[PDB]
């Protein structure tokens, strides 16, 4: 059968895979439009972060650890409780080597960071939501992936230089008013999506916001 | 020299590319001083040679009429096409102007009355575009203009060049998709420039140019003469007959779409560069023989420019396009370095969007829309030098008129519309008016 | 509409056949994968209907 | 000063994310100019030297009684230690931010406001002290030859104040540190607002590139 | 004759753009032939301008300018060779690389 | 009765106070920016 | 006066893409199934 | 239907070649539409087209 539109395939929930005891996470493959290449054993290109997410999916990325360190610097005791580790018919016999053949460097979508907006939004998230209630290990991998995507790279711009950045943020916010719905930490940030994701991951009693 | 070198060398990039190369260098020979009749004879000879080599001519296997329900003349040039155009249209209008005229005629026929023979041509063009949108997007940028073409196999190993096998093909494709601003501007930093050069090295045209005088080129010629798998239909190597059959199958069951109509009109509509309307100029021209003996004057070289740049846009179109497409900081730095007037880039982009919205319902704000429409709107501004006899003024109209008077080898020719019939027109016409 | 139904059916056929060849969670995938505006399980139900 | 008031008036009427990159760049340039001006004014009132308009080195020497003929003769000479080989005439053309004449001693000071104190200090040194010391040797040789009754003494002092004004008192033990640091904190907050919030999110990369080219 | 045109001569010399990166121009990434490096057998290798540009970019850590490239390779001895296959390009004129 | 119904609706399951639509001619963004501009609030409390 | 105004407006009228789309909307097919009488009459032939 | 045929012919003439006699008809139709869009909109609904 021909004219199969593998590119139109989308995934809503987790799409797992097992092979000789090796656990695989196929959501990045589907979102990147490489389902056909994985199925039919065709070459493709993926960034190393996608490879790490696909292979392990049980060890949080260094971005989440850096975000946890940033939250600890801002306000301890409200950090994410981290317990995981860091970082017609076609038959597939070596899916692991197949995926490793796709790994390469340089195909990463870097985004323009805003050093002060990052720290402002991190503290808004710290105060608004209680992140020390639900264990991240038992969180849904599908939502953890999206959180890691939206927080990727925040630590690399603020941990090395924090005190000057924090003082600049305080100077900017104390003198004139800042609405915490226009702060843009990076070019790939959406307030609505991030806030709904954080609401769904960390429930809050709506009575406090209405009573 | 060019007339005799037009024969031996085989580009081996396919029917359309070989035909385009032969016609373009016949046009160059005409520019250097060849008579239009000798240029026409050379064009006919090269067209016959390429048709026989690829089997396109009527009488052998690869004839399009045996696999398409469309006339031989009406078949697109990338498929089995008739490259017997006049040297006047080749020199003045362009090389891929036959496809543009065919598409314009097909859209005109589709209106007024809704026939099927013209929607068949529309479906053939859509099939060509579908085939084209499976390779590097920068191939359509520059070089000869085309709506879409069939890709042909490259019969030479990639290991011949030392650095070709440094980045994989999928790597290059995904880098090109991610970094589209580098299709229009050259990267400055080594990190992007090295990938740009590796992608440039694997370009089939450049590969053939590097292997142009090598015995390896006989492989492609023998594969084409034997009618073997040389073309692409989806992810598989297919024969030209299979491509023709697939084109017929796709065109017989093609339904016209409003967005497809808009994109076809985008192809048919005016250009971002001021282009002279050669079609209506030649259609409405008239030549009269004046009984005067031929006088052999001297030779002077004049710059015959056919595509200019709108003065309202202070920056080059590639610079503005790359600035719009640039999303990374280093891409922005590169486009600012290339642009001569960085402060006016936003103004130029705004005027570009306003003009596109004025002439077309398409909005370039969406990255996909501008990505698809940019190569069909922006064309190169290459300049040419044409050897002329006497007092020919340094304008395109004067060079064309001199060519018209030069058709007869013995008889003096007078052009009846002696007034200025220039049609320097661009997308931006009413911007100052509005 | 017929073309979209045909494409959805063919894609479901392909993913099912691939899951058959290997060892894959048929139903779990069919409750996960999404096509156009209808999930795979709902596509199966519509095909039954 | 009043320039800060005008800038604040212009920028309180702009909604967040509605400024083109070039507008953000020139507003930032105006803000840095305002910061440099207010530091120049604090030093102005500290030294009580009402030299509102900056004067050229040649003009400063003219105010010091230096004859014009020797200056004209020296204008033809070339600095051997200049990185770009600039002539003495152009070095006389430029105007330092402030100056003071006390008998035979003339003090030249260049002030910059930046986070990297050492980099600004060394840049101002390599820009000024080479020509200043060449002029010092020239006037010493003239004094030895006898064209001036008293030798001149030249002193160059460069002070860089950080964006937060923590070390401004250490370098400048003035009585007026509090008001100046408050004003400079205000202008720093204004700069942060312009660079990080008011810029359109679709042109943040353009702003970053323009800032890198202009200032780095 | 040249002393009466000093300003325009200076402008023309400065307009050559000596500060742009060396390998960003078209003329230095073209298909014109260029000698490579000395191989093991002791024969200079016939190569292309684009290949040599890629080699230098791979070995180097930045894209140098014309002056910077000259300074880096000032101590390098000049080498020349006769082309293996003549011409091979419409822009290839001469017999030495 | 309306207040009791609102309490019943909000206590049992969570309600996000950015999707509540009081009437067909309501925009959360415009109303909130208008109320911010009319009644200033110290942004330090929302960020510190 | 209406004729003069029509002439004045038409002599200085510039075509627009949206205007072209709306003119095609007028020219295009209808929401009701209509028989194409124009091409039927153009292509018809009667014999005595 | 006479107006519809005239408008169709005018749009057909405007394509292929860009003359002025046909854009004149387009401008006349636009003027008519401008005059029409100054009264009740339900007048165009129903009755003669």
Author numbering:
A (entry chain A): 1863 to 1949, 2028 to 2151
B (entry chain B): 1187 to 1620
C (entry chain A): 1621 to 1669
D (entry chain B): 1 to 216
E (entry chain B): 800 to 896
F (entry chain B): 2104 to 2151
G (entry chain A): 1428 to 1475
H (entry chain A): 1283 to 1331
What do the study authors state?
Hantaan virus is a dangerous human pathogen whose segmented negative-stranded RNA genome is replicated and transcribed by a virally-encoded multi-functional polymerase. It catalyzes two fundamental steps of the viral cycle: replication that results in the duplication of the viral genome, and transcription that generates viral messenger RNA (mRNA). The active site cavity is located in the core center at the intersection of four tunnels: the RNA template entry, the nucleotide entry, the template exit, and the product exit tunnels.
(ii) The structure of an isolated apo HTNV-L WT symmetric dimer, that is determined at an overall resolution of 3.0 Å resolution, reveals the location of all domains, including the ENDO and the C-terminal region. The protomers that compose the isolated symmetric dimer and the external protomers of the hexamer globally adopt the same conformation, named conformation A, whereas the protomers of the central dimer of the hexamer adopt another configuration, named conformation B. The association of two protomers in conformation A results in the formation of symmetric dimer A that can be found either isolated or at the periphery of the hexamer. The solvent-accessible surface of one protomer buried at the dimer’s interface, as estimated by PISA27, is about 4200 Å2, indicating a stable and intricate interaction involving numerous binding regions. The central hubs that promote symmetric dimer A formation are the CTER domains. Of crucial importance is the extreme HTNV-L C-terminal loop containing the residues 2142 to 2151 that swaps into a hydrophobic groove of the opposite CTER, forming specific interactions that notably involve the two last HTNV-L residues F2150 and Y2151. The CTER domains are also involved in stabilizing the different domains that compose the dimer A. The CTER residues 2052–2056 and 2111–2127 from one protomer interact with the ENDO residues 185–204 of the other protomer, leading to a mutual stabilization of these regions. In addition, the lariat residues 2044–2052, together with the mid-link 1905–1907 residues, make hydrophobic interactions with the core residues 1357–1364 and 1513–1514 of the other protomer.
